Structures are given as structure tokens and as C-alpha cells.
Amino acid sequence: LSSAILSEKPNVKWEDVAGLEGAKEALKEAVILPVKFPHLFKGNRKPTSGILLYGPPGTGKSYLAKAVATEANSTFFSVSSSDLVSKWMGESEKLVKQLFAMARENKPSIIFIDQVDALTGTRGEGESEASRRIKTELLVQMNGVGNDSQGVLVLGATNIPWQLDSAIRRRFERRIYIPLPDLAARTTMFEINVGDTPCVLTKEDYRTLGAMTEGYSGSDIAVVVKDALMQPIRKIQSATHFKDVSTEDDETRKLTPCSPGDDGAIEMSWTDIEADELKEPDLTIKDFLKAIKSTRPTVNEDDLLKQEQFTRDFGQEGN
Numbered sequence: 001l002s003s004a005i006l007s008e009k010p011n012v013k014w015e016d017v018a019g020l021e022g023a024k025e026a027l028k029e030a031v032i033l034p035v036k037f038p039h040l041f042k043g044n045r046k047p048t049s050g051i052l053l054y055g056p057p058g059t060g061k062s063y064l065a066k067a068v069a070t071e072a073n074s075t076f077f078s079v080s081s082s083d084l085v086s087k088w089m090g091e092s093e094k095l096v097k098q099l100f101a102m103a104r105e106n107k108p109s110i111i112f113i114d115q116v117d118a119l120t121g122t123r124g125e126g127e128s129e130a131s132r133r134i135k136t137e138l139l140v141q142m143n144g145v146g147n148d149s150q151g152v153l154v155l156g157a158t159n160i161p162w163q164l165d166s167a168i169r170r171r172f173e174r175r176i177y178i179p180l181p182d183l184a185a186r187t188t189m190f191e192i193n194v195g196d197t198p199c200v201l202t203k204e205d206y207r208t209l210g211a212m213t214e215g216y217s218g219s220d221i222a223v224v225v226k227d228a229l230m231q232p233i234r235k236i237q238s239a240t241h242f243k244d245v246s247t248e249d250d251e252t253r254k255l256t257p258c259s260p261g262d263d264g265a266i267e268m269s270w271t272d273i274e275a276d277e278l279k280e281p282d283l284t285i286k287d288f289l290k291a292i293k294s295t296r297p298t299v300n301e302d303d304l305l306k307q308e309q310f311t312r313d314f315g316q317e318g319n
């Protein structure tokens, strides 16, 4: 029981997820509240079996689910609809069945169907017979998740709530919107992503970098920082000259790269430096700007519109 389906006791706390305060809240009421106080839900008030998370690409939907499942001391079982409907097309019902199977045997637990939209785009046989089986098998499995037992909740995710099979949509009672990151979020994300790395920037800087990347998403900023992080490696990769900037207090001499005429520079390469005596240059403001300036926000307003529309026409109620 593996491969196409991922398992784990995930370890992501609400604090690990940047901003999304409103969504985080939503989920506590929808998920943690029933879990922790369970027979608050006697009678006609029953808990939610289906929760969809929609938003534009990169806004934390996957991460937040893990966070949910961790904040609900749960086990996380997750499938990638794309793959499921295109790369595992052979054993899709087998896999869907196995997903729900494994969930129930590991109660309490959460199922994460990513890219729920990838179960539609309908034609005649390829994506409308060879596929519709999967749509059904999932639908059937979920008749069993409002019935059978509830210690198993389905979370679904899309970046395209407007391609979500009508039938499938309705099966997710509660729907929640995961927007692009606010300045606040965007700043903590820059910090989170950089964490330990030796780095010049003060908080105000990050504040500014945040300010400078409005429109960017979670993945976007992640790309940026990843990119930014190779500056030091690249620099270390390509002097020429190194310096011994260790102070009277380092155990060992710390040889950082430097301009070639420059006080104390002696010409070498990284291949000359010993294990203990290398000193990666700190990230610089310029490092980050360079990175940002060669990234473009992945999400454009066209997307956002369709996103807001769905919020309006299906956001809440039914539907």
C-alpha cells in the first residue's frame, strides 16, 4: 500500500502557514472542533465530511491541509488527480478504493484529493468514459464518508474551481478561499524561506521585500528565495580571491570570497579551501532584488476574477 498514494503523520502547525488567518480559523471550526469535542454534533447538526480549498496556484492549499491534519492529530493520505487521471489511469479505481480503504484503517485521518478539477474537461471516451469511472468511484467512496463512519474527512483542492464537475462540487459541503499572500504573509514567507542562512537583512528589509513582491504567491516567493540562495554558492564558486575574515574569536580561520585587489586577498579557488575554513558570503539586499527582478508573479488578474466569481456564485451555501 504505497506509490501513487502518499501517507504521513504530518507535522505542520498553523504557525508554519503564513497568514491565511481567516482560512485557518474556518478550518478549526470545521475540522478541529468536531474532532476535539465530538458529540457537540448530536442530532441534525452533523460535522462536515467534505471541505474544498480553492484559490489560485501556489497559495498554500496543500501545506494548509497538512497543517489541518497535524492540528487534528491525524494521518494524511493524499492523491494527485493529475497523475491519477493521466499517469495511473490503469489502476485508478483500484487506487481510489485503496485511498479510502487506508483512511478508515488509520482513523482518525484525512484524505487529500489534489486537483479535483482534473476529473472533468469532458469529451467522449478518453476524458468521458475512461475517466468518468474515477469520478464515480470517488463519488461512491464518499457516499461512504457521510455514511459508514466519520473519523475520515475529505479535503479537496483546485486552482480552477470553474472546471469542477458539477456533481463533485456539490459533494464538498463547505468551500474555502485561499488568496494570494498579504504583505504580512509575504514578509514572514521571505523570512521563513531564508531562516538560518547567514544574512545581512533586517526586518525592515524583509518588510520591503514583501512590499516589493505584492501579486507574488507562496510558490513564487519560494522560487525567488531558492534562487536568491544560490548567490553565495555562485560567488564562492567563482573567485579568484579569498580573505580571512575570522575575528580573534573564531575557533578556525574563516576564508570568504572577496574582490581581487583588496586587503588580505590571496588568489585561490574553493578547491583550495579546507572543510572547516570556508565562509559563505551573507545574503545581500542585491541578492534578493536580483532574484525578484527575474521573477514575474505567476498569477495574473484574469485568474483572480474567475476565482472571485466562483466565490460569489458557489462560495457558500450548497451549491
Ligand SMILES: Nc1ncnc2c1ncn2[C@@H]1O[C@H](COP(=O)(O)OP(=O)(O)OP(O)(O)=S)[C@@H](O)[C@H]1O
Binding pocket: 016, 017, 018, 019, 020, 055, 056, 057, 058, 059, 060, 061, 062, 063, 064, 157, 159, 178, 189, 192, 217, 218, 219, 220, 222
Ligand atoms: N501560507 C504559506 N505559508 C508557508 N509556505 C507557503 C504558503 N503558501 C505557499 N507556501 C509555499 O509554496 C509551496 C507550494 O504551495 P502549496 O502548499 O502546494 O499550496 P497550493 O495552493 O496547492 O500551491 P500549488 O501546490 O502550486 S497549487 C509550499 O509547499 C510552500 O513552500
Ligand SMILES: [Mg+2]
Binding pocket: 061, 062, 114, 157
Ligand atoms: Mg497543491
